[PDB]
Amino acid sequence: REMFAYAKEHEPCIIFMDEVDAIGGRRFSEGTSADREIQRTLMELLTQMDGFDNLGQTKIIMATNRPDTLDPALLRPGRLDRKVEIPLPNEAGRLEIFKIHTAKVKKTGEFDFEAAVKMSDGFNGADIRNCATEAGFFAIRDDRDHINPDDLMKAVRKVAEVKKLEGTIEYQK
Amino acid sequence: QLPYLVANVVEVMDMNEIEDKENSESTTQGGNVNLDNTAVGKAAVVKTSSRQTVFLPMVGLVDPDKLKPNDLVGVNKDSYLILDTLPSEFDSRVKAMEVDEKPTETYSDVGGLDKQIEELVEAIVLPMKRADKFKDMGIRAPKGALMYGPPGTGKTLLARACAAQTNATFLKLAAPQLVQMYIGEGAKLVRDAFALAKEKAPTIIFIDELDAIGTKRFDSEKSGDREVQRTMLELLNQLDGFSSDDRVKVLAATNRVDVLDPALLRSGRLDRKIEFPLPSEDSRAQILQIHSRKMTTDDDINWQELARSTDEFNGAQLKAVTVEAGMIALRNGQSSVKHEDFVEGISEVQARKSKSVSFYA
Amino acid sequence: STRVEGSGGGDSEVQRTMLELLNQLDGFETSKNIKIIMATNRLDILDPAL
Amino acid sequence: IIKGKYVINLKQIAKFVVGLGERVRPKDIEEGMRVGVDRSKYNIELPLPPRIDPSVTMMTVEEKPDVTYSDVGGCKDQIEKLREVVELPLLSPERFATLGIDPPKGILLYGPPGTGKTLCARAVANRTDATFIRVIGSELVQKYVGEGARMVRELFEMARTKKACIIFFDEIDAVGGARFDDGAGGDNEVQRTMLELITQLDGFDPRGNIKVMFATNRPNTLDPALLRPGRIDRKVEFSLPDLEGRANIFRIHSKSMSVERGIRWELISRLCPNSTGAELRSVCTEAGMFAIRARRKVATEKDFLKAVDKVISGYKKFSSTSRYMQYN
Amino acid sequence: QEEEKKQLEEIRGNPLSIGTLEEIIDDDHAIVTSPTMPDYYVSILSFVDKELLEPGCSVLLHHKTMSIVGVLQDDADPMVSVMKMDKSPTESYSDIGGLESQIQEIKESVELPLTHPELYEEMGIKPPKGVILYGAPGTGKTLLAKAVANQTSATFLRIVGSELIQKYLGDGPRLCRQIFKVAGENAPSIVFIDEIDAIGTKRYDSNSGGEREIQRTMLELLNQLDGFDDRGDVKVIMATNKIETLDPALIRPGRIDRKILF
Amino acid sequence: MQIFVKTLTGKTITLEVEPSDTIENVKAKIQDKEGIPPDQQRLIFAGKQLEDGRTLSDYNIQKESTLHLVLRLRGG
Amino acid sequence: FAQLPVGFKNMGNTCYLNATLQALYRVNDLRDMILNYNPSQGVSNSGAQDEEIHKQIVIEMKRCFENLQNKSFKSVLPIVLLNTLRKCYPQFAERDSQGGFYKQQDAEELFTQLFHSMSIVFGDKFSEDFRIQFKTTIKDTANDNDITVKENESDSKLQCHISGTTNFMRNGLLEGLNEKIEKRSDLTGANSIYSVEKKISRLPKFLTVQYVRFFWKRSTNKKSKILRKVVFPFQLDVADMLTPEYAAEKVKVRDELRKVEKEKNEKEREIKRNESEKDQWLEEYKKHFPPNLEKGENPSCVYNLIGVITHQGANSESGHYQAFIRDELDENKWYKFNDDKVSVVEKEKIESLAGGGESDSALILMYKGFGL
Ligand SMILES: Nc1ncnc2c1ncn2[C@@H]1O[C@H](COP(=O)(O)OP(=O)(O)OP(=O)(O)O)[C@@H](O)[C@H]1O
Ligand SMILES: Nc1ncnc2c1ncn2[C@@H]1O[C@H](COP(=O)(O)OP(=O)(O)OP(=O)(O)O)[C@@H](O)[C@H]1O
Ligand SMILES: Nc1ncnc2c1ncn2[C@@H]1O[C@H](COP(=O)(O)OP(=O)(O)OP(=O)(O)O)[C@@H](O)[C@H]1O
Ligand SMILES: [Mg+2]
Ligand SMILES: [Mg+2]
């Protein structure tokens, strides 16, 4: 309640809810008392989001890792007006991510990514930066200080391998 | 001198300092000439653990550099003046995590498991010690390493031995401890667990058993699993960088790796994923020798004979042969343990009582 | 809707507890004056032990 | 602890800074320890044992019932295995020091009921005169989750302070079972305390003279890391009495009864199929109700026959004349 | 009379500050936690017999420096009110007139060893323990139990099996553990569990009821019924006509000694 | 001689004394190095109490001996 | 008539003296010695005059014990003893305060002083019974340059030093005999660190372990009390403190002591409707150790408590001693002595004295060997 207040004296505020699944829960309360604790805190939000209290320069950015956990009154538009999905990086969307992360590292000189990455799919954007980290271990093994395309081509095999350990399946609206 | 109240600071909202001719405040008051009449200097609002707030004029020996708008302070109990500053509070279970200097069980009490050691040093230790070469390389360290594989392989044993061998602050944490029927007190062990860790950085956070808070569920229907997962979610938050976690690591041991949450498949939580395999021919031979070194044997023992005749025996079974031989030695009545006894401990203790009744198998 | 496949009625579970006490209520302080007025939509959906 | 004052938080939740009186020693303050402070000006007077949160583990501490050590049936060999694992290293860790082996600590008690699963552990409680701390697996489940996590953890460490103790895990078929996933279950909240049992047995420190018994009706479902062979070391299958073993049990039972001499304890075993001794404990007592019916002070052959028929017929009328739930 | 009360009231309060004794220390001290809040490390006047008080007691603290002035002997729950009874049936046996030889199996192993242990001393060995009543409904099972309780005049507890099944977990086992702990505490008791057929056919929701609830409670009962407690005399009477929804360690002999078919 | 007093604190000390100098001098030098007043000290060697005016030659003590420092209690 | 020992009465709170006396009489060979002895039977004194007082003290003890046997005194008369100890040791003739109160003695202080009086009257043979011989190895640390073997190192009570990190019996006991000692040494400079470790060579007939719950604060300059609960069982087995060579001898006799112990649990029932075990332990005595018997050599490693001196008190404050003494006439029977009060306690109640926090602290653990 008092955080929204802060938002009305501070200019154009932006409220990032990070990784909310805690009070994302549904009506439950046939389980433990924790589920009514969720409930109490949830009702609080609705009255703020829409009512005589109306926003305009207070914005909600809500970050979650799965949206079908939530209660549907937290899927309610005009509180959530745009529902932006960011998918997994694409065939050449990995390429675009790679060119910013090869500037950070020391490299022989590598502009030969393109084929290998598209056909080593299975990466999210944070795993591209794990190809660079794991390629810096193959480098350390050789006693190199540079990322080679010899180091890189062993790295994409490894990094893909360790993610097949468990799957992930998610569907969306 | 003692005793005094221990509190935190709501905020410092200062008032203008005392040099003026009309008031010395930030909030306009009725009437004119004032400098000490109702005017006051800088202001600190502090919140007690007796559950109020008081607007006090802050002590002029304690600076605003010694005050943060969360800082833990002493407050004189008789009359509320900020007495001193103290370090941030920690719960007793979080004081119970810290090191005792557990002994090193060096790589010589380990039997087999060479590949496992190599990855372990590679993943955790070297990013600390060659932290200059990680920067020169231009890469970031991997945030932690997952240890998984069937029980029996000495998952928990190896981590203790090697963390103590190379000496990085070894935090002892068991995941079920994070589970509590309190919320905002049991979730607080996580909160304090990173606040402590950044001060004692670099440090490895060893969580044994990552299934008590490593529930794959976060679609829950009508259960108290929503209480459980809130110590899963607060973990993922401080495993994100809002820096002062780059030097804080994670090791995790767990019996099974098919029960983890999809937010722990991702890199940035446990980037390196090490599997513990069931023993090999060479490995099995080594293990037996490591136990039998403790006890007294005869000089007619051949450690390959035993290792041939045991196939797909895990290290816990193998420990359970070397102990079993000296049971048989005591029953015969000896003071030395033959090579025939270990062979009989294969049958007396394995994992299973015989192949079964077979009627046409 | 899991209490109708769980007991034929979760109210009838409580109803059963009352009714068995009632059996010896013929004098413990001198016989009944607390009646069981029970009600329902039918008795084909009541337990056959009521 | 702040190195050279201390921070205490009272039970009245209220935090204060305290120091050292003149009945305190500084070497004697440890983290999480309870202390007494002055009700007026908080200062430590007398430190106090740690941890007031356990209070229901003082009712699972048990004096040793004199079911006697000879009370157990037979002179069979399965209880002599136990006397090698548990009993003897308490009496003599010398021979295990001469061997140099690590002495085995854990053991599984399993097999059919009515074999006196717990009856030999009451005998062994007579002999060893170590502390017995007895646990019920269904007593480890509370209304809210994580509450039983507290219970188990603290129970173990209290036993670490205790010296020459034994923890008798009884009936932990519930909490103690196998781990698996449900994705919507309520079994998860139970499996928390199942895990809590693992993490203390191995620990990050060994068990310092904690001898450990698990008593399970069933091996058909158990954890594979509470049944890993290095922390339950030798596991003893407890069996059905033989055709000799029933004669031994029945002789312990009928020597306790007044019978008129010249009888066979062999004959009664033959008449029975392979069976429990808990039946043999009840062949005597139901034959005694037939003894009072005829108004004997004694028991004779006649009334034994009736009794043997009586129990067998009800056994057939009932489960577990074939139930073992397969495996060996 | 005069002098004993005088100097008894001289240390005894004015406000008597009910406390709850968590545990005792053998240095003439104890730690109490009061329901008001703050704990105290209390002394003990110790004319009250150092060793007569135990965890779970209600203790009288002094309105000044809290010392254990005294100790209340007894306290009770409304959940054991359901268990215990004030009744005195106006029916005695032979208002169960008929079926008068399968009722010698319930007054030779329930009634008689309380009445005469002398008979079981001639034969020696342990006396009877336990019955299970089973048969068709309405054949008198209900009144059989209430008819031996009028004869014996020992603490008759009666508990329904639909209250042993609850919609909350964790408190299920604590209830079942309790019955026999109270029952052993008074030296003679007969515990009527009416309808142990009700544990597989009655169940509320399936996320706090279900398999799990039912399994635990059964497990608890095994320890209680016989187990390792060595509690007081709890002669047990069970009525049932679902006897094959019970364990084999329940219908095991020596907890059922003579079982009655009707 | 050089003689040693194993204190209850967990450390052994060295004392420079002469065997012809009494137990009273021994307690005086402990008071210098520890602060225990020299009349709470009970010094045991051979299970015998050591008393002032008896030399370290009347109990025939010689170097490479450890006297053990224990402190009296009062009753009543 | 009475069925269990009549108590002792206070004389202005002589509880510190009462407590020691009871436990000393349960010491097997002590109670024989004072009664067997007679004045002018051949002992005479040309040395110290305190020898004369020593011999009275032996007599005074023997008369109190005779009164203790009688059941026509309902309270024993200490009186005669008090005065001879005041003359013998003027430490006891002081005032701790006025009012008819005398100097309140430590129980340790009386234990040693009485033992000195007896050791001189009966000579060296009696001395050995309470005294432990060590086989000490004095070794230079960082590669021995010498071995000094000392067999003149002896205490009548082993010191169990607690610094608030010992809380178990084996620790502290073991780690008070192990110590580092700074020694002037021409081997490695002019001061070298020698490791001195005493391992027990010959076990005493009667063992005393002295617990240290007393402490000198060097921070307020006041005594304080270690308030740490020290947990230990009844039953002390010594083989972590034995010398390796001597350990082998002692275990073997002990092994047979457990064997006959198993048989007694059955047999004691039959005979009701000491020779059994002793005869076995004596036959072994001759094989492992010199012929027939010796003073201060006990092949048994199992030790049963005969008394605990319990103190109630703190810093240097005046306190109250209580004593628990083992009944020798009933086995597993213990008598609680609150000086005038005498109660029945089981052996189980003795372990409960391992606590503390303000009172009921075990100060002295009195053992008798089990083979003796
Ligand atoms: N590779 C090995 N070499 C030598 N000993 C081993 C090995 N693996 C296991 N052991 C022995 O088995 C013991 C038990 O292992 P530990 O319990 O630490 O392993 P774990 O993988 O964590 O198993 P779990 O946690 O499932 O019980 C170790 O203390 C060690 O002595
Ligand atoms: N081996 C035996 N020798 C003599 N008596 C026995 C033996 N086994 C069982 N009994 C007798 O049967 C009684 C009950 O058995 P007990 O309750 O110990 O079974 P349990 O093995 O604990 O089974 P569960 O725990 O599964 O119900 C004992 O009190 C005893 O009188
Ligand atoms: N054999 C009998 N002799 C005398 N009276 C009987 C007999 N059988 C039934 N009755 C009468 O019928 C009654 C109704 O019996 P009750 O309600 O006790 O039967 P029940 O068998 O316990 O029923 P349920 O099957 O519902 O458990 C008794 O109260 C009793 O007086
Ligand atoms: Mg482990
Ligand atoms: Mg059992």
Ligand SMILES: [Mg+2]
């Ligand atoms: Mg009925």
